[PDB]
Design a protein around this nucleic acid. Structure first.
Length: 49
DNA sequence: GCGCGTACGTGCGTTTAAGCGGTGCTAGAGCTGTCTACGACCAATTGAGCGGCCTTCGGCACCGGGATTCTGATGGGCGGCCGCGTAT
């Protein structure tokens, strides 16, 4: 389930919703919620340490 | 302020390559046309997430008890007080 299937530490089923409610393009590409959680986690980790 | 030094502006001549308009070629943008996959939407169920509320062990810095070391009144014995004092 999202983190699982994706294999990330970030919420994949949270940024998908905001990107569709922000109202960016007409519909949303399937690519992004998942990809978009990934880089975010990556940045998150780069600072903490 | 002043004074020394030199580098950077202004000139001419030499030189080098942009800009002009001439043609040719085909690549890659733009259009166009059909399919269908993927995202929005509506539904119903489920647990991740937020407020509300209070947890426990480890680490900084203040602490604890027991043997041991150093200071003080005590005391017999060898010496010195020279000055009042009794005896012949």
């Amino acid at each position: 389930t999202r983190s699982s299937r994706a294999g990330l530490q970030f919420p994949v089923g949270r940024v998908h919703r905001l990107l569709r409610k922000g109202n960016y393009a007409e519909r949303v590409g399937a690519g992004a919620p998942v990809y978009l959680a990934a880089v975010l986690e990556y940045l998150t980790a780069e600072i903490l340490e």
